[PDB]
Paper text:
The genome release intermediate of SU10 b, d lacks the tail needle and contains a 277 Å-long nozzle formed by short tail fibers and nozzle proteins. The tail of the SU10 genome release intermediate is reorganized into the nozzle built from nozzle proteins and short tail fibers. To form the nozzle, the four nozzle domains undergo an extensive structural change from the L shape in the SU10 virion to the straight arrangement in the genome release intermediate. In the new conformation, the four domains form a line pointing away from the portal complex. While the interaction of the short tail fiber dock loop with a short tail fiber remains preserved, the connections of the short tail fiber loop to the beta-propeller domain rotate about each other and bend 135° to point away from the phage head. The same rotation is performed by the short tail fiber. In the new arrangement, the nozzle proteins and short tail fibers alternate to form a nozzle that prolongs the tail by 277 Å. Furthermore, the distal part of the beta-propeller domain of the nozzle protein shifts 3 Å away from the tail axis, resulting in a broadening of the tail channel. The structures of the SU10 virion and genome release intermediate differ in the direction in which the long tail fibers point away from the adaptor complexes. The long tail fibers in the genome release intermediate are rotated 6.6° relative to their orientation in the virion.
Residue numbers in the entry:
A (entry chain G): 253 to 374
B (entry chain A): 215 to 266
C (entry chain B): 162 to 266
D (entry chain C): 162 to 214
Write the structure that this text describes.
Amino acid sequence: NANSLTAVITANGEGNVTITADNGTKTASCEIVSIPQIDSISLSQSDVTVSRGSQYILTATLSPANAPNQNITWTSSNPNIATVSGTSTQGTINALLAGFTEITATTEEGNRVAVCTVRVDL
Amino acid sequence: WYSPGGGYSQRTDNDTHTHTISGSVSLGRDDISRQPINTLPPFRAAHIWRRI
Amino acid sequence: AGGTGGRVFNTIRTENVPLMTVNGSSFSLSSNTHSHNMVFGRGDASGHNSSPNWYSPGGGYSQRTDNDTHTHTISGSVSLGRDDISRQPINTLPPFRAAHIWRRI
Amino acid sequence: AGGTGGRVFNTIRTENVPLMTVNGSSFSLSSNTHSHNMVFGRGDASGHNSSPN
C-alpha cells in the first residue's frame, strides 16, 4: 500500500500460493488459494433440434449477472454439422442436414468448463 | 391397410399381425468420456507442517 | 498445532460424488420393413392399420399393384439417447474417517 | 518413522474408483414410406421375401 501497511492482492491465475509481507526484520506469511472461479454458466437450451439451414439462436447465461472482462470462446464439436460464435449469443447455424453437434461454451476469462447443448437435425 | 372393403377385388394378401417380428439394430452409446473435476489452481493446497 | 499434520478436516482432500457429462451424439436405428412374416388368415376380420403384404400369387385376370420387388434399402435416423451417468458411491463407509500416519522423524 | 508420509502399499487412506450407471434410453426410428426406390412393374418376376412396395 501507500503506507506499506496494506497490500492489495490480485488472483489473476488459479492454484494455491502464499503471499509474504513485512520484509523488515521478521516477515510473516499468508496463504492465498487461487481457487477456480467455477462460475457455472447455463445454455438457454440443451436438447435442441436444428434443421437444414435454420439455426436456433442460443445463449450462455453465466451464474452471476456479469463478470470482469467476461467473454466466451464458443466451440462447436462437429463444426461441419453446425457452428457457433460470440460470447453471450451462440447462433448455431447448421450446415449439414443430419448430425449431432455438441455446442459447448468456453469462458475465456474464467473456467473453461461450461454447459453443452447438443443440436439435433431430426 | 385402412380396413377398406374391396369393391370388386379380394384383398386376401393383407391380414392382421399376431406375432412379433425380431429386428436387428446397429450399435449405440457405450460409455462417457473423460471429464475435468476440481480446479488445479486451488487444488492440493499446501498445509503447514510446523510442529507444536 | 501438532507434530504430524494432514488434510482431513480442512484441506484439499480426495473422494467426492462423481459427476460427468457426455457430448451430444447421434444414434442410428434402422427399422427394417421386412421380416414381418404373415399372421392370422384371410378376412374374416382384420385389424385397422395393418401393413399390407403380398402372397406371391399369379393374378389370373387382375393386376397385383400392391406387390412389388424392392430395389433400394431404406435408411433411417434414430432419436437421441442417454445423457450421462448418475451419482455413485465413493469410499467405504466402515473405512470412513480412516486415520493417516503423518508423524515426522 | 519418516519425515515424509504416504499411504500406498498399506495405510488407512480414502478415495476409490466411483461406479455409476446411466438411465435407460430407447431408440425410436421412423420408417419412412419414401426413398425405397422402385424397379420393374407387376410380376412378371419378383424377388422372394422382398418387402411389399
